[PDB]
């Protein structure tokens, strides 16, 4: 086997074959006839080798187009497979870039594309008559002559079409596969001639694929390049045959952008969307363009995961591109299996390592290879990645174009209301044993104190592991357990129609009672005024607790691990950073990221419980199938003293995802941080970190990344408010910041500083940067309204209603203007009604999604009444 793997490594397209077709190829390299079989398996493109009993006189696609080389391959009887294989692959890229300069210098020379046609092939016709086009576009640019070539092209195009009709079947495929391309052409320019000026036809020329040519290259094969919207793309001169064309429209030049705005921060490309969209279609139509043969990866369709492993390594190799077609359609073992390698060779191309490991094997990787994975709806919605790969890939929305009886029956319904809550939500449960030994804190009308204490001591153990909803759920409900059984029927039917009005059940006024005002008609007040915040509140006030932070459990509580789940707007790290600052302890970060930082994160684990130092695990979830297998018998059981005297382990985990295992979940504490920084606040916390890096572009640039964080800070302020703003909750990550601060730079660092491409730069993030997740047309909306307000200003913008932010001046400093950014954030206040008056919808959805909140809140604690 390890000369099959040898020979694996002399010529890498054999990790396609697999171990049955290359030991045939190994053996019958003297009759040299059999291999040509083999050849659309590890090619993609071509067919069969075309011989002359003497040498290699060229090769066929599958499609029947003969193609010639321009080096015959000699045989003899003493070669191998390897050699001529070898000698075939650089032949057959040289003859390819032979023709295509032929074309060019033949094009270039007056000639007739009818004539050019049958004699070459046609992807050099196609480069060519594009680099043609474009180049005679960008002079058109400047002398708006756009009428002049309209006509040329149009001419051309009725040139083809009457050639079409009188052609044979073999070259028909080529003239409608020129006249596709000749369409979009003459799409473009009719769409650059209706432009008013020359700003509206270079924010159209940005989006369109720009094919140009390096003179003083002398490295031929490096010639040709590809510039959209400024990123640039080597064009790989592979051959592709006659491939079936798209029709190009507006979305597919759209889905193109975000591939090369992926690829130029070498980020792998995924976009998901229901089937029959054309997803797969669109990334072989993006490998066509740049001359490359994308090799599709066929999920859940009777493949065992040996040959994927053997496909990804060959991939890695040979540096071409892969498609996951349909990767949702996958069995857990496999789908966690392939996305570690997927993430072991994304991590390889970000960071540049020249050898990775996969499959325990030791192997290069070469630069330019690239996975793109599409994703076929779900069924609970739109399928989604795992959570290994969220950090790695930009997702984009691809679519068409007696005393202890009393105190007994009060505990089985403060039980039972708590596993009702251990019921709805998989992180919120409680075992009994945690109850009996919070019931034992309570000693350090003996009855009616014992009872009134025990309910303080519930609210205050049991209130950390919940959120703010089921926090005022259980306050409720634990304040009507009390005063329903201690106080009159009159109290309960008065709280009842109260808490009906706060629901939509039954509204009814009734008296509030004789003389009970000073007890009541507090909560009625806060009706008839319509405000749930304070009423909602006021049962929380009536337990007269301090409500226990986060520092107060664990210093009071006796154990070593700690769950703190929450939601993706907000991390628990800060919190600890104070918090062990406080208690002068120590802080790890053991990222939870590969292979080698599972290893680095058991090793860490298994001395600093020895030496007695906290340590944090950041997103347990996304490797929760190591967890299972050995973290979960790690700090299952409890061993001794050593530990619990030194050692406490925090574990950062996130509301919505994937399950944590039970009893694992059990075992440890619950915590849940739901701190929700203002606005303002998160504006200082965005700017506060760019100058830990410095900036190095220009004075430009720093107000360009003012903006960037204010725009930030304004789109995650309008994600929390789910019912009124965004349609569905969207998750926005400092990943959006980094590629909008990237395209900020790119845009500045190649144009005057005139005030114009606030024309281009506005629509690239609402559409690209932004817009990438978002699938409903009216939240993209939205955002367009948004950055279309946060972007565009002439000297003066107001992008809150207190605060104006004005132009950089010219005396260009900017450590000056660093500090005049600070000063203009220090002068703000942040009014009461920020929420409603930063952000342009009016106060009364504030009040109608406060209304929302308030009856989900009343409608689940009568629900969780009338049951016991």
Request: glycine residues 6%; hydrophobic residues 40%; proline residues 2%.
């Amino acid at each position: 086997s390890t000369f099959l793997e040898r020979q694996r490594r002399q010529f890498p397209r054999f990790y396609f074959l697999g171990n049955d077709d290359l030991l045939k190829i190994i053996g019958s390299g003297k009759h040299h006839d059999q291999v040509s079989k083999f050849m659309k398996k590890m090619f993609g493109s071509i067919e069969s080798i075309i011989f002359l009993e003497d040498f290699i006189t060229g090769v066929r696609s599958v499609e029947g187009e003969v193609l010639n080389l321009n080096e015959k391959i000699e045989l003899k009887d003493s070669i191998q497979a390897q050699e001529w294989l070898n000698i075939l692959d650089t032949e057959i890229k040289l003859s390819v870039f032979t023709q295509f300069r032929d074309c060019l210098g033949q094009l270039k020379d007056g000639t007739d594309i009818e004539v050019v046609v049958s004699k070459y092939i046609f992807q050099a016709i196609l480069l060519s008559a594009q680099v043609m086009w474009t180049e005679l576009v960008e002079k058109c640019l400047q002398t708006n002559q756009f009428s002049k070539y309209w006509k040329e092209v149009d001419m051309k195009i009725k040139g083809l079409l009457d050639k079409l009709n009188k052609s044979s079947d073999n070259v028909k495929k080529k003239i409608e596969a020129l006249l596709v391309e000749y369409l979009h052409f003459n799409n473009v320019i009719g769409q650059l001639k209706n432009c008013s000026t020359k700003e509206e036809a270079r924010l159209l020329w940005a989006k369109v694929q720009k094919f140009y040519q390096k003179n003083d290259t002398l490295d031929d094969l490096n010639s040709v390049f590809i510039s959209q919207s400024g990123y640039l793309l080597q064009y790989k001169f592979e051959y592709i045959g006659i491939p079936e064309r798209l029709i190009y429209t507006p979305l597919l030049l759209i889905g193109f952008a975000t591939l090369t705005d992926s690829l130029h921060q070498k980020y792998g490309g995924c976009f998901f969307g229901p089937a029959g969209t054309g997803k797969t279609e669109t990334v072989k139509a993006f490998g066509q363009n740049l001359g490359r043969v994308v090799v599709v990866f066929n999920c859940d369709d009777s493949f065992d995961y040996q040959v994927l492993s053997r496909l990804l390594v060959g991939i890695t190799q040979i540096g071409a591109w892969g498609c996951f077609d349909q990767f949702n359609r996958l069995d857990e073992k496999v789908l966690s299996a392939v996305s570690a390698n997927i993430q072991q060779i994304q991590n390889g191309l970000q960071v540049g390592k020249s050898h990775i490991t996969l499959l325990e094997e030791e192997t290069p990787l070469s630069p330019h290879t690239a996975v793109f994975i599409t994703l076929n709806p779900g069924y609970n919605g739109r399928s989604e990645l795992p959570e290994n790969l969220k950090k790695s890939f930009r997702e984009f929305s691809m679519k068409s174009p007696e005393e202890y009886s009393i105190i007994g029956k009060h505990s089985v319904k403060i039980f039972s209301m708590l596993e009702k809550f251990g019921q709805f939500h998989w992180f919120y449960g409680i075992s009994i044993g945690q109850f009996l030994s919070c019931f034992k804190r309570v000693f350090i009308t003996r009855v009616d104190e014992i009872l009134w204490l025990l309910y303080q001591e519930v609210y205050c153990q049991f209130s950390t592991a919940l959120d703010k909803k089921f926090k005022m759920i259980m306050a409720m409900t634990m304040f009507c357990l009390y005063k329903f059984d201690i106080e009159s029927e009159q109290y309960k039917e008065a709280v009842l129609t109260m808490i009906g009005v706060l629901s939509e059940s039954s509204d009814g006024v009734p008296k509030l009672t004789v003389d009970t005002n000073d007890d009541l008609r507090y909560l009625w007040d806060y009706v008839t005024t319509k405000s749930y915040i304070s009423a909602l509140n006021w049962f929380k006030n009536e337990f007269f607790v301090d409500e226990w932070n986060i520092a107060d459990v664990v210093a009071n509580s006796e154990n070593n691990y700690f769950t703190m789940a929450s939601e993706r707007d907000v991390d628990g790290t800060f919190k600890l950073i104070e918090l062990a600052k406080a208690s002068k302890e120590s802080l790890k970060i053991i990222p939870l990221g590969s292979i080698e930082n599972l290893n680095y994160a058991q090793e860490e684990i298994s001395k600093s419980k020895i030496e007695g130092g906290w340590i944090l695990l950041q997103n347990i979830q996304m490797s929760l199938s190591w967890v299972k297998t050995y973290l979960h018998k790690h700090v299952e059981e409890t061993k001794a003293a050593e530990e619990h005297e030194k050692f406490k382990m925090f574990m950062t985990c996130h509301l919505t995802g994937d399950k944590l295992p039970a009893p694992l979940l059990q075992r440890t504490d619950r915590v849940v941080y739901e701190d929700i920084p203002g606005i303002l606040d998160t504006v200082k916390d965005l700017w506060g970190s760019q100058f830990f890096t410095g900036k190095i572009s220009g004075v430009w640039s720093v107000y360009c990344t003012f903006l960037l964080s204010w725009f930030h800070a304004l789109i995650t302020a309008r994600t929390r408010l789910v019912p009124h703003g965004f349609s569905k909750k969207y998750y926005f990550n400092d990943c959006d910041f980094q590629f909008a601060s990237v395209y900020l730079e790119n845009v500045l660092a190649t144009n005057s500083t005139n005030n114009i491409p606030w024309a281009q730069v506005r629509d690239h993030i609402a559409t690209i940067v932004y817009g990438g997740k978002i699938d409903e047309e009216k939240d993209l909306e939205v955002v367009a309204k948004l950055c279309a307000h946060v972007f565009c200003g002439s000297d003066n913008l107001q992008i809150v209603p207190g605060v104006r932010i004005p132009q950089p001046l010219l005396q260009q400093s900017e450590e000056e203007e660093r500090a005049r950014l600070t000063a203009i954030l220090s002068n703000t206040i942040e009014p009461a009604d920020s929420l409603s008056s930063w952000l342009q919808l009016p106060r009364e959805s504030i009040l109608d999604y406060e209304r929302l909140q308030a009856k989900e809140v009343a409608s689940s604690t009568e629900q969780l009444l009338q049951e016991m």
